Structures are given as C-alpha cells and as structure tokens.
Symmetry: D2
Subunit: 244 residues, 4 copies
C-alpha cells in the first residue's frame, strides 16, 4: 500500500549507488512502483549497480545525444513493460558539463553540456509522451540557477536553459494530460558554497542524504500534486528562501 502502487515509471541517470536517480529508484520501488531503468555508456557497470535495488528492473541503453537511441526508445520501453501498457512516470536525472573556467570554456564544450543537461529533457518527453497515460508525470532534476555562484558556471547556465525547456515541455505534455516539473535540490555529495546551505536552511540540509530529494520526486510522480505543471519544487531545506 505504497504512494506509487501499480505505477510504471522510467528512471534515467543511475551511474553509481550515490546517484540521485539510484535513491529515486529505491524509494519508488519501496512505494510499489514497477520501474524501467535507462543508462549511458557503461551499461555492464550500471547493471551491477541496479542489482543493489530492492526489486529487479529492466535496464535499457540511452545516450541522449544519440538520435537512433531516442527514435527506438518508446518501442524498447514497450517491449520491457509489455504491449498494451503505458508509463505513468518519467524521471530525467541526467546532467553533464565538460570540465572545459568561465571565459576559457570553448563553445563545443558548452553545447555538449546544454545538449545533455537541458535539450535532452525535451528529447525524452518527445520520445515518451506517446507511451504515457493521462494523469502521468515527467520530473527532471534542477539546481537553482537564479543567482550566479563561484564554480558550476556553465552548468548553472545549462540549468537556466532547463527551467525554460520545462515550461515548454509542460505545454506539450498537457495535451496528453501529463504534468512536467523540476525538483531543485540542494547540494548532494555524489566547500564554502556547500556549507552555506545548511546555515541558510531553516530545517537544515544534509549533503550526504539524497532521501529527502528522492521523496520529493516521488511526491511529484504521485497523484497528490495534480494541479502543478511547468513548475519547480525546491527540496533544498528552504535555503533559497533565506538571505542569511
């Protein structure tokens, strides 16, 4: 009798057992969801990580920069969940920005980072909306980019683009009766900038614990936020609401 009982959910972005996607997958299974997982490049390595989850789940290859992987994705998911079944949820937990810092980054690096971290949220929704049920939910991972900060410079730019992409994805998803939202998380250990979060957060922030973030994603995947779309839910201990 779980929050996601009977729901079929695709979870992308597992690379290690410290991945936010690993914790999202674990919490979703504990809550009764039937998962389909996607991985990039190191598929044998990813499969061994997915064996650590409480329940067995099929693992599909997905390089978001590969148009052939995107064109075949819905058919491959349909084979995994069975003909006649559709997804109730999609989790985008993918991000990358080449190490290149701000003025020295060539455009080839920035473009690759934006492709993977922002444009792919639209690519995944385009591929999967035709196999999603009404009342469905698409959730992506964000970090608040409204202010510039030292380090993560071009990744912050990619998150600003992702927030805008999410608002357009919501317009398309709405046609299918599907919601689209981002979870803006505080820093997770997957220094001064990081320590400031626990200081600002009225309820504190534990950088070593991804469970509050995973629970927030599951709340959006559930039927309990049915009138929220094109939006951002902050799972950051309330740090973004406080100056000092």
């Amino acid at each position: 009798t779980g929050l996601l009982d009977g729901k079929r959910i695709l979870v992308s972005g597992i690379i290690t057992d410290s991945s936010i996607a690993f914790h999202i997958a674990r919490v979703a299974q504990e809550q009764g969801a039937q998962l389909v997982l996607t991985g990039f490049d190191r598929l044998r390595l990813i499969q061994r990580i997915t064996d650590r989850l409480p329940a067995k789940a099929p693992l599909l290859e997905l390089d978001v920069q590969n148009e052939e992987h995107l064109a075949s994705l819905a058919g491959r998911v349909t084979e995994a969940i069975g003909a006649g079944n559709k997804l109730d949820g999609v989790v985008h937990s993918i991000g990358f920005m080449p190490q290149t810092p701000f003025f020295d980054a060539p455009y080839a690096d920035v473009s690759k980072g934006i492709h993977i971290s922002a444009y792919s949220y639209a690519s995944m929704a385009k591929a999967l909306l035709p196999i999603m049920n009404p009342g469905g939910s698409i959730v992506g991972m964000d970090f608040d980019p409204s202010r510039a900060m030292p380090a993560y410079n071009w990744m912050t730019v990619a998150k600003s683009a992702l927030e805008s992409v999410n608002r357009f994805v919501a317009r398309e998803a709405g046609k299918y009766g599907v919601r689209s939202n981002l979870v803006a998380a505080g820093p997770i250990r997957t220094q001064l900038l990081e320590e400031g979060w626990d200081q600002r957060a009225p309820i504190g922030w534990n950088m070593k614990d991804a469970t509050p973030v995973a629970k927030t994603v599951c709340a959006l995947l559930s039927d309990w936020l049915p009138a929220t779309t094109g939006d951002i839910i902050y799972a950051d201990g309330g740090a973004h609401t406080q100056l000092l």
Copy 2:
C-alpha cells in the same frame, strides 16, 4: 492505509461546504487524519457544515484578531486531542479584505486595509506562534495564497495582503525550523467559493477565463479537490526538505504568458 494515517491536524477557515478548508478537511479525513477544526463568529452555522464531513471532529472558536482566543488556543487544542498528544499539521485557510479594498484601489481607507492585512497575513504568524509549542517534529504548517507577483484589475489590496503573507511565511519558516516543523503556502488558482458592481465582476470573469486558457493542464474553478490534495501532500512526510516556500496548485497558469 492513507497518506495522513494517525496524523493530528488543525484545520481553520471552514465557513461553507464550498470553502477550500472544507475540501482540505474532507481529503485529510479520507486519508486517515484526526482533525481539530476552528471556526470564526458563526459557530452554530459552521457546526451544521462540519456535520457534512466524513468523520466527527471537535470545533473550536478562533477569531485571529482576538488576542484572548490566540492566548488560550494551544490549551484548548490540547484538551481536544488529549494531554500528552501534539499536532502534526496546521492549516491556515483564512482571508478577508473589506469591500473598499477588493477607484477601489485609492478609495480604500487604511482602517480597512489594516484589518485585511491583520486577518490575511499577520494571523499566519499569530497561528504559528500559538501552535508551534504543541507541534511534533516533522510537523507541517500550510497557508493559502493567491500569486501576487503581478498586479491584477481586481483583488487590489487583497493582492497586497498576499504579498505580505508570502514574506511572513519565510519568517515563520525560520521559527518553525527550531521545532523541526516546515511552513509553506499553496498558491491556488481561482475557486468559486461563496463570497467569491459591473466592472469588478467583468474583471474577475476575464481573469478566470484566461487562467484555464494559460494552464497547460486546464483549470476548473468549480473544483477545490486538486488544491485540497496539494495541501495534504505538504502535510504528509513526502516533501520533507521544503520550507518557507510556495507550491502552485493553479494548473501551471503562472508559468505561461499566453
């Protein structure tokens, strides 16, 4: 086996069965919560309405402008739930702006604006001050908001009161955090509640019609259930790292220009 199984929750703001608080109370009870209800002024009338809820719940009087009601509130709640028990949730679903403030903008006297701000914004801090000493860690305080980031033809001073409420919520979160309690607002789209000239109504109509147009998933102003479900999500253990914040239950209308 409900979302709020075993939780003790105080719900303020029921006046009619169309009240957002009525729907919040109904959904919470369906989800296993044990409620304590508070009403203002028309207590006999409110008891007849709360008799329509799926389960029995004690009804306490609370006028948020009455300092004696606020000073005695925690003791009265403790008596209703039993000594040794504490609340897990608090719902503030209270708002009022006298007619003059809702040239309506320039003609509203300060006495009217001050009363509206007292009831709609300051009282969120008053309720938290009174109830935090009787709230359990992991607890949740939720208030009702209407997005006031942009001015709109009608609502005028009520919009100003909501801007003040959003700021109050951020300070309440600082205090609530000391008790391991979250404080958040639900910004709802327009709902056809009881209280909700020619121009005023025409402005509301256009505002209301644009909302459903702008919302990617649409907006039904006759249905308070999506709003009630969102409040219950915040009262649950499923948004444990969210505080001093605003969750929008508006069909996504605020995220779209046209």
Copy 3:
C-alpha cells in the same frame, strides 16, 4: 542637467544623512526645482545647494493628504504641475525590527509600520497624480525583501507589501501618463544604521547585522560602499529623468549587483 526645468517633490528628509537629502542634492545639481515635505528639518534643508519650500506632511494625517495638492500648487505657482515625486519614507517600531523576536511584534506596531512604509506610497500618488504632468515619474525607496533575513523582520514584510503597492500605483499612474517605480538599495549607513554598528543593539545582533552588511560588498561584483548614498541618489534621478520612458511598476536595484550573486 539631467532634470533641467523639472518640478520635483521630495519627501523623507530628516537629517543630512537621509537618502532623501542626497536625492534632493543630486536633483538640484541636475537643474530640478524642488518642493520638500517633512514630518529641525528646515535647518537641514537649508544645507541643500538651492532654496526650496518645505511643506508639512504626516502620511498618517488624512487632512495633510487632502490639502497637499493645493499646498504644492501654491508653492510652485498656479498653472504649474509636478514632473516628479520621491517617496523616501519608512518606519517600523523596535518591536517589529531589531533584536525583538519576530513573534513578539504586536499588530498595532506592525500596522503603524505598514501604514507609513507601504500604504503611504498609494496615499501620496492619490494626492499628487491630479497635479502631475504626462511623462511624470513617481519613485519610492525599497530594500529587497524576496528572502527573509535576520533582524529586519516586519520591515521586510512592509517592503514586500510596498513592492505590491507599487505595481497597483503604476496602473493608476498610467492613466495620467506617469510612471511608478522603486529603487531597491543596498544597506546605507544613515543615522540609526551607524548606531547598530557601534553596538547600540548589543553584541549578538550587532555581529549578525555586521555579517549581513559585509556579505553585500563581498557578493556585489562592483563592490558596495555602505557609507556612500550618491549611487542610490543617481539611480533615483535616472528614474525621474526621461531616460527610462518604458519602465513602470518595476524595481531597479542600486545594490552593486549583490542580489544577482549567491556567493
């Protein structure tokens, strides 16, 4: 000058450290003809580069508000109208800001604070719009209240209300071809502000206010000088000029860019 020939009303002078004193000085240096309002002040306004009539205005006094336009018309001469209005008025009792806990502020104190700091922006616009020329500009003073901070408490709440009031004032002002905007300044060492740094409110809160102030210069990409009100006064004069003609119901940040940076 930037404001050559403009007739501008400036409220909020109490000392020569008042932001309004600096706004008035820069405006006169830029060729504006001023009318001043105060709630002792005549001895301070005598320190400005040019002579200007001083009118009494208690924003909580409805008789002062009802007679204001007539009194301004008498000061500037029949047939003349105002081009600009500056609201540089703010108040919150010590129970609502400083060392007092957020929950311990009584509503009577908060309400007086909101009346003076937010509602009066609408009162002033109501009284003066009938005597303002098209292309006119109303400017108010703000402190970014988007995030909660220590000590500022109910004054931050009053600023959140002021920002909302400004958006509604812009709707009304637009009917007269007048703009309405706020300048959100960084912290300025005015009369009360220097005392807190000195230790007037104690060690614990004095350190917290000092950290809040020091972080500003650290976050600001161009730095922030708390001792200098001139960049703020110049920003207000930019809004009073004809150089931001399509900006209304808005907020211009004169804070060194601190609000755009997290660390």
Copy 4:
C-alpha cells in the same frame, strides 16, 4: 551637453534601419558618443544602412561564431579608436534562431544542431564579446545586451525563449568577470518590436501575444517604436545607474508587472 558626451562605445547588431541596434546607435550619437560599429556577413549592405546614422563611424566585421574574428577584435577596435584609448561601453544586440526553433515549427521538432547555433549566437556570444573587449574597457564602463523576458513560456518563441533564459544566466556570470575591471554588465528586456508570412493560425497567436502587451502595459506599448528601448540602453551606458550590474532592466511599458 549629451548623456554620453565623450564616451567611446561599440555597437553590434545593425542589419537594417529597423534593427534595435540602429536606434541604439542613433540615440547614443545624438547624446555625444563616439561609436565603433560591428557587422555580420552583409558588410556592404550594413555600410549603406550606417550611412543613415547622424554621424560617421568605423564599421568592423564580426561573426560571433568565428574565433579568429573574436581573437583580433580588440586590436581592430584599438586601431579604429586610436592607440591609448579604451571603450566606455559595449552593446550586444545580436540574436538568431533558425525557423526550426522559433515560429510555426512544433517545439519538439527543432534539431539540436539548429538550437545549438541559436544558443551560440544569442547567449554564449555575450560571454565571447565580454572576454574580447574587457581588456580594452575603462573603469566605470558598461556592457549592455538585449533580452526578451523568458520567465514564462509563450507560443511560437519556443527555443529563442530558451536561448534568452541562458543569456540571463550568462549575464550574471559576465558581471562577475566585468566587476574585476570596474565594468557593469546588464540586459534590457524589451517588449515586442516590429523589426501573413507564417500562416493564419500562428499569425493570429503571435498577434494576440503582441496586442496583450499594449493592454497589460500601464503606460501602453508601441510595437512600431524602438526609441524607448534605445533610450533605456543609453541610460545603462551612462554614469546614472552606477550601482546596477548582473541585472535586467525592463523597457516593456511595465507589461511584465501586470497579469491582466
């Protein structure tokens, strides 16, 4: 006495006399600024347009996707303004998004090659321009870019809105770098400017979006007139907003502050 008397300002983005950059250049010259102009691809065509400005100004070639143009830019500007002189202002009025990413094409049908080109020209180039020109800018200087409020999604604008969201973030980082030189960096978010071609259905949607602007704006909005936008850019180039950086100034009639 002009607002920009004696200031040396670089203005990019002129293609036609309807370009926002044309109006920025005109107002800056009327206010006493000495300009250096940059143009892309159609240099002969751009020269005929810049001949319509009140004063003569050198025109330099600048393709923001060309790293050799960027590497030589500061040296070429120094030659145009004279050795020992530096710039007081820089105007970025450059934007591009292929028809696959903006217009009638569904949001999901824009290929990444087209989106990436659009982001390179419309957002990344703001950082490229600042990197090339900050070493030849005076303290108290000002870098200004053109923006269109992307905080809410809207029909047709699609990936150009995404590019503007990226530009706003780029501006905040450029301000951190510019601050080291005592230089400000800001964007001007303008309302729509007229700078059946796309069909009935989309043509009506774009028209409704445009008409709502004048309705929302408390002081109205004239889509035919770039002068209020050009004046706002000149205010940021002046010494009158000295404590504003990493920020956005809205020259949109106040439309973004009103719901209806």
